[PDB]
């Protein structure tokens, strides 16, 4: 009924598919990819219809997740702050379709909704429990989670605790060792825990005031054996081992720590007024940060030193959200109006530092040390949003006009750490005034039902994302390698237009869905782009187009003659991106992907299973200038086509105990995902400092995942 493409996965579906990270969440979503395989920083984030990075609005309970951050080989943070084990559902929206979400959802939005006491407490009972134990063979990871919810008088409470402990996600390369000859995944030790607490008061009918507490800590100790013996030059060591045995990077060990703490208040109630029938608001405070610690034996020919690096990227967020719902009728049309405000107060800090100690004498090495440096002047970003949306029903038509006004103000704060960055480079030109942006983003959706089975829809939406502080103020000079990074204080915000139309058909014997989209991007921000020694500067791509077609379908085979419960389904996604400034393709566009399934479900749901077949085309349209091959050699690697088989099954051992099992990569095929390959080396610095054997970025071989869920 919604005039847009949105995919929802419930808590039960996540348990069925053994979803332990967002990479496994998008396994069978053909138009969404998650990268980061083989990278030190780990899982990067979502790629929706060729759009990834900070242009995807990732939020949990309305609170936006931190953006990416790259500041060299020892400073790289991704967007992996959410544990999928604490959500009741996840919604993937494509494009800035909704006015209720922020306009910075250029490529789409991924929304997480945490578990509520209602979905834990059984019907007819006042207390509930949920114990889960799971194992994943791909990363040798164990999961243990426990959730308890209760309902006493007019108060409801929920307490969730989960703990993960595992290792690195294995690749399908069969050679270990060190250097570029290592095709196995770098060893890792990953520990994670997540704490969720809710306490609500149901003081009236349709009214609830609640408290939310949330903590999440992820600790990964990595051994970058693939980087031993570096640096490398076009796939070969820069310094021959005959003269420097072991290279300049004798060994490199690291630790990445992710943290998210969130405290929130939410309130909704029913009102008898002419302005609204239902009002909800929430106030949240979130502290999310990433800590990268690097240790290495550094041997720059003349001296042996222990070189350490520390990087912290932190975001403190205050967000107030509101939404007032009013229902009324004007003549033959029924109206459903939703309006409100959204206030954001964001502080972003980034710090880099390092030390150097001589391994022969024990003395300090100032040449190998780094003082505390800030890449941006600790900005304070205030966002004010006003939105209104009306759902108008007239006969079989449904019109959804929308408006969202966004106001963004950024306040720089010059500190001594940032002044040091202005000293490292010879660029001391910084503007201490405030930068302001504002825009009205219209949105329109139309739905029409006909022939008792079909639905036509059209969607028009606009997106708006303001520049970040790193692009506006980041500066760095490398006289040794002959390049520098210039800030772009005149960078313009992104403007996008989304056009989408489609046809849906619902039957008792199955359903289908066809979608065609056309997205135009104006002033597409290309951070750290190489101009034309060398200059890296964030610039605006004036025009960019991404278009494609998505196909969905499901057939109930029992109606055509088959055992009841047997079904088949398919999902095919195609995209086409072009940079209209230079005519080059957009490398973030995934190849033609299709997922086909043959599944069975028992009549009472006691057991069932699904056989999945994923077919992906070979990548063809590649921009050679902006694509850096992971191995660094002259030849550029394009991912081939492949087909893989996966089998999921589920059995109810008891009325409370359910066993979910899944076998992946049945034929044990060595294959690559394009998003992992094209995203490994974003700027080209990794080709020399942390290269990847092409087999180390391959997907895991034959593996299984099993979990046991006890709903007491």
């Amino acid at each position: 009924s919604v005039p847009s493409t949105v995919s929802v996965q419930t808590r039960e579906q996540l348990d069925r598919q053994n979803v332990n990270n967002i990479k496994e969440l998008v396994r069978y979503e053909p138009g969404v990819s998650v990268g980061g395989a083989g990278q030190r920083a780990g899982i990067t984030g979502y790629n929706i219809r060729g759009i990834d990075g900070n242009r995807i609005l990732t939020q949990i309970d309305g609170v936006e997740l931190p953006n990416d951050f790259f500041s060299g080989p020892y400073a790289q943070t991704h967007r992996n702050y959410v544990d999928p084990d604490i959500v009741k559902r996840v919604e993937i929206l494509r494009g800035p379709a909704s006015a209720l979400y922020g306009s910075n959802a250029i490529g789409g939005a991924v929304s997480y909704f945490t578990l509520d006491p209602s979905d834990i407490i059984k019907d007819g009972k006042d207390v509930g429990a949920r114990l889960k134990a799971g194992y994943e063979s791909a990363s040798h990871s164990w999961l243990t989670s426990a959730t308890v919810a209760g309902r006493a008088d007019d108060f409801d409470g929920l307490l969730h605790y989960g703990y993960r402990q595992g290792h690195e996600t294995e690749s399908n390369g069969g050679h270990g060792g060190t250097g570029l000859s290592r095709s196995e995944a770098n060893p890792e030790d990953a520990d994670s825990y997540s704490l969720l607490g809710k306490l609500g008061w149901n003081y009236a009918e349709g009214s609830r005031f609640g408290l939310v507490f949330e903590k999440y800590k992820s600790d990964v100790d990595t051994d970058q054996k693939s980087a031993y013996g570096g640096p490398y030059d076009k796939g070969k060591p820069a310094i021959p081992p005959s003269m420097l045995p072991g290279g300049m990077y004798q060994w490199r060990k690291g630790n990445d720590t992710l943290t998210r703490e969130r405290y929130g208040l939410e309130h909704h109630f029913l009102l008898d007024s002419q302005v609204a029938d239902r009002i909800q608001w929430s106030l949240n405070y979130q502290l999310a940060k990433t800590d990268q610690a690097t240790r290495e034996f550094y041997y720059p020919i003349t001296r042996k030193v222990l070189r350490t690096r520390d990087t912290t990227y932190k975001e403190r967020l205050w967000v107030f959200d509101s939404q007032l719902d009013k229902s009324f009728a004007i003549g033959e049309t029924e109206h459903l109006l939703s309006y409100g405000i959204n206030l954001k107060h964001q502080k972003v800090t980034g710090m880099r530092s390092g030390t150097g100690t001589n391994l022969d004498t024990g003395a300090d090495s100032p040449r190998d040390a780094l003082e505390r440096s800030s890449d941006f002047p600790d900005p304070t970003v205030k966002t004010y949003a006003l939105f209104a949306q009306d759902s108008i029903s007239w006969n079989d038509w449904t019109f959804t006009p929308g408006l969202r006004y966004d106001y963004t103000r950024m306040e720089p704060h010059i500190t001594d750490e940032f002044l040091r960055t202005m000293k490292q480079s010879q660029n001391t030109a910084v503007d201490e005034s405030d930068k302001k942006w504002h825009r009205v983003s219209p949105k329109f959706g139309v739905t029409y039902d006909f022939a008792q089975h079909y639905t036509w829809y059209g969607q028009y939406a606009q997106g708006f994302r303001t520049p970040t502080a790193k692009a506006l103020y980041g500066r760095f000079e490398n006289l040794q390698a002959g390049y520098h990074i210039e800030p772009n204080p005149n960078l313009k915000p992104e403007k996008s237009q989304s056009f989408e139309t489609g046809l849906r058909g619902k039957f008792d014997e199955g359903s289908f869905g066809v979608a065609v989209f056309y997205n135009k991007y104006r002033d597409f921000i290309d951070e750290d782009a190489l101009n034309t020694g060398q200059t890296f500067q964030s610039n605006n791509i004036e025009r960019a187009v991404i278009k494609g077609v998505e196909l969905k379908g499901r057939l109930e085979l029992g109606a055509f003659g088959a055992p009841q419960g047997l079904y088949t389904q398919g999902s095919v996604a195609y995209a086409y991106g072009r940079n209209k400034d230079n005519g080059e393709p957009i490398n973030s566009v995934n190849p033609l992907t299709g997922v086909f399934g043959l599944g069975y479900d028992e009549a009472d749901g006691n057991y069932g299973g699904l056989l999945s077949w994923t077919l992906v085309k070979r990548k063809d349209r590649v921009d050679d200038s902006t694509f850096h091959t992971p191995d660094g050699t002259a030849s550029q690697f394009k991912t081939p086509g492949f087909g893989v088989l996966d089998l999921s099954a589920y059995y109810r051992l008891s009325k409370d105990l359910t066993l979910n099992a899944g076998l992946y990569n049945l034929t044990d095929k060595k294959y690559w995902l394009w998003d992992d390959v094209r995203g490994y080396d974003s700027v080209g610095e990794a080709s020399a400092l942390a290269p990847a054997n092409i087999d180390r970025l391959s997907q895991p071989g034959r593996n299984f995942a099993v979990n046991l869920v006890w709903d007491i």
């Epitope: 640096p231 820069a238 310094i239 003269m243 300049m248 720059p300 020919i301 390092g354 040449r367 190998d368 040390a369 780094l370 490292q424 010879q426 000079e477 490398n478 006289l479 040794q480 390698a481 002959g482 020694g533 020399a688």
Partner: antibody, heavy 127, light 107 residues
Framework: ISEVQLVESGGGLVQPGGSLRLSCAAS????????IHWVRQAPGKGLEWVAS????????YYADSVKGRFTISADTSKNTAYLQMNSLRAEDTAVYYC????????????????????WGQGTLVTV | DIQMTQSPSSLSASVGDRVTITCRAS??????VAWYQQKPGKAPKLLIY???SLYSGVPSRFSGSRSGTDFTLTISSLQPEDFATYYC?????????FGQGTKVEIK
């Protein structure tokens, strides 16, 4: 402790207007990622930078006083730098030094490497 | 293009004295200024690089400083082996420019 050893050769009495080739053999680490510089000192005068070669980028640089007449090249297989001097004048007589820059491609930018830390003994060219 | 004016051209100095050699640039330049010591009949030896950093093995008597377009080389306690000619060199990458040179003699 001693990364490279630089030795110059090819210097001597060339009659004015003639040609002469100077070679700079390096013993030790290869200077493919470094910069090799030629510096000459006329008798009783100061140091004057004349040319430079960066093998990694393939870039060559020259002073105005020697532009067009001098050619600088490198081998990177013999670890030897060459300075082809043509149309020599009486003002070109000096002691030509071969020097290697401290800064190189993979040096840490926080190390602040700058200048030439290794020099040859020099060869006398008399025009 | 850029010029480095080094003053003085000669310093009469006594063992134990503190001497200062100043090098002034003709334009706006970065900190890429190096200092060299040359004795007669010998190749130049690098002492200070990046206008402040002491090269490994060079005695701590030598020191570098910067003030705008003026660069300073200082010897806190002159010693008998420090009587030579000193040159300031400007530039991180080519082209490079050397100073006129300052000869330090015995007072």
């Amino acid at each position: 402790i001693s990364e490279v050893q630089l030795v110059e050769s090819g210097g001597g009495l060339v009659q004015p207007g003639g040609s002469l080739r100077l070679s700079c053999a390096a013993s030790g680490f290869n200077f493919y990622y470094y910069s090799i510089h030629w510096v000459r000192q006329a008798p009783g005068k100061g140091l004057e930078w004349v040319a430079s070669i960066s093998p990694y980028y393939g870039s060559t640089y020259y002073a105005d006083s020697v532009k067009g007449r001098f050619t600088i090249s490198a081998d990177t297989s013999k670890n030897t730098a060459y300075l082809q001097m043509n149309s020599l004048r009486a003002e070109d007589t000096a002691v030509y030094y071969c020097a290697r820059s401290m800064n190189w491609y993979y040096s840490s930018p926080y190390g602040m490497s700058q200048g030439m830390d290794y020099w040859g003994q020099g060869t006398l060219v008399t025009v | 293009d850029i010029q480095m004016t080094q003053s003085p051209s000669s310093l009469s100095a006594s063992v134990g004295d503190r001497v200062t050699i100043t090098c002034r640039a003709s334009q706006s330049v970065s900190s890429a200024v190096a200092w060299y010591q040359q004795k007669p009949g010998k190749a130049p030896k690098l002492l200070i690089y990046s206008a402040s950093s002491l090269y490994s093995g060079v005695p701590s008597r030598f020191s570098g400083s910067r003030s705008g377009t003026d660069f300073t080389l200082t010897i806190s306690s002159l010693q008998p082996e420090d009587f030579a000619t000193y040159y300031c060199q400007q530039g991180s990458s080519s082209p490079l420019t050397f100073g006129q040179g300052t000869k330090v003699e015995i007072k």
